[PDB]
Amino acid sequence: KVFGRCELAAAMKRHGLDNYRGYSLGNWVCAAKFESNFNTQATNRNTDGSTDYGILQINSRWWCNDGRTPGSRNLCNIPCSALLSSDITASVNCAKKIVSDGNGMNAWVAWRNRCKGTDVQAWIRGCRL
Numbered sequence: 001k002v003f004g005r006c007e008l009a010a011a012m013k014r015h016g017l018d019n020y021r022g023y024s025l026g027n028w029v030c031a032a033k034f035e036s037n038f039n040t041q042a043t044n045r046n047t048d049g050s051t052d053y054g055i056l057q058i059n060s061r062w063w064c065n066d067g068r069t070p071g072s073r074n075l076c077n078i079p080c081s082a083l084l085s086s087d088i089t090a091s092v093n094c095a096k097k098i099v100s101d102g103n104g105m106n107a108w109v110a111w112r113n114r115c116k117g118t119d120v121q122a123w124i125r126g127c128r129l
């Protein structure tokens with residue numbers, strides 16, 4: 001599913017991501033925009049052989065099982081394919097574990113390079129929330 005900007009903001013908010021670990025909603029929407037262009041089916045293969053999955057491009061090296069990343073962990077305890085669902089619940093739950101782990105949203109390269117330090121509230125401007 002390719003979400004609209006406000007549609008995704010409202011889904012994220014209902015799932016408890018607004019101000020989660022201090023990160024306002026615009027941060028999450030910005031990260032999703034640049035990681036996946038709001039497409040829950042996005043996949044990208046990394047050089048080490050791991051793959052990134054879903055709207056927030058969660059990586060198989062640590063967070064989900066895809067059966068082809070030898071030596072990896074599955075800290076969210078899910079198949080990576082669950083992260084490609086049109087229902088973003090699995091992706092949100094796993095992201096909450098990721099952002100709690102100490103590095104905050106710096107775990108998302110696109111957030112660090114394209115969202116951090118910018119006016120992220122712009123990503124939710126105009127939305128009914």
Ligand SMILES: [Cl-]
Pocket residue numbers: 024025026027120121122124
């Ligand atoms: Cl915001």
Ligand SMILES: [Cl-]
Pocket residue numbers: none
């Ligand atoms: Cl772009």
Ligand SMILES: [Cl-]
Pocket residue numbers: 065066067068069070071072
């Ligand atoms: Cl594996």
Ligand SMILES: [Cl-]
Pocket residue numbers: 021022103104105
């Ligand atoms: Cl933090």
Ligand SMILES: [Cl-]
Pocket residue numbers: 114
């Ligand atoms: Cl940018």
Ligand code: NA
Pocket residue numbers: 060061062063064065066069072073074
């Ligand atoms: Na894994």
